[PDB]
């Protein structure tokens, strides 16, 4: 269960911490929110091996981009992800949400499903557990929310995704991307379960 939500001050990425092999939980404290640049992050869903390999290559491309042309746009980062996911669609199982903060463009969210298509959205949800919160997220999402409202929106949403999806669980990790900088948040079962 992963999602990225744009708001007034920028964008927040959210994810559960569950990695599975069939019904066995290989890792219950996974970090699915991964840095490809200072203020361009991605949510990883699908194959752990494929999404890691992709994110590592993208981080390499954006580091080499920065050395030559300075800070890349969030759109540029999403384009590099798409290029890898689209051209290798036959050999990849990767559902990636790209989220970044520009000073010009503010918070932006790009979702890249299995096919390798790109979709720029106000917010995005993905992963097995997203199916259960389409109804909830559509009804509760508002544009230009505050930081605290967006954190509550992601927390409540992933709480339900985790509750219904056996493939989702553990802690709720969140990454806040604003002009202020990068803030990591974590929320434990005892809090979010009884929402």
């Amino acid at each position: 269960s992963i999602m990225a939500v744009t708001f007034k001050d920028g964008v927040i990425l959210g994810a559960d911490s569950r990695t599975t092999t069939g019904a066995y939980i290989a890792n219950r404290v996974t970090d699915k929110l991964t840095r490809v640049h200072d203020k361009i992050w991605c949510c990883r869903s699908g194959s752990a091996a494929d999404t890691q390999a992709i994110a590592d290559i993208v981080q390499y491309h954006l580091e080499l981009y920065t050395s030559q042309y300075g800070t890349p746009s969030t759109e540029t980062a999403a384009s590099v992800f798409k290029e890898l996911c689209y051209e290798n669609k036959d050999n990849l199982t990767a559902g990636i949400i790209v989220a970044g903060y520009d000073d010009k463009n503010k918070g932006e969210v790009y979702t890249i499903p299995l096919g390798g298509s790109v979709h720029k959205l106000p917010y995005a949800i993905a992963g097995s557990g997203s199916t259960f919160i389409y109804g909830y997220c559509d009804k509760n999402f508002r544009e230009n929310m505050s930081k605290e409202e967006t954190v509550d929106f992601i927390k409540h949403s992933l709480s339900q995704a985790i509750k219904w999806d056996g493939s989702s669980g553990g802690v709720i990790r969140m990454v806040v991307l604003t002009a202020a900088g990068v803030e990591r948040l974590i929320f434990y079962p005892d809090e979010y379960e009884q929402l």
């Binding site: 269960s1 599975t20 194959s47 752990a48 199982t93 992963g127 557990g129 997203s130 992933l158 985790i162």
Partner: peptide, 5 residues
């Protein structure tokens, strides 16, 4: 199997 939220 492989590792696969």
């Amino acid at each position: 199997x492989f590792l696969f939220x």
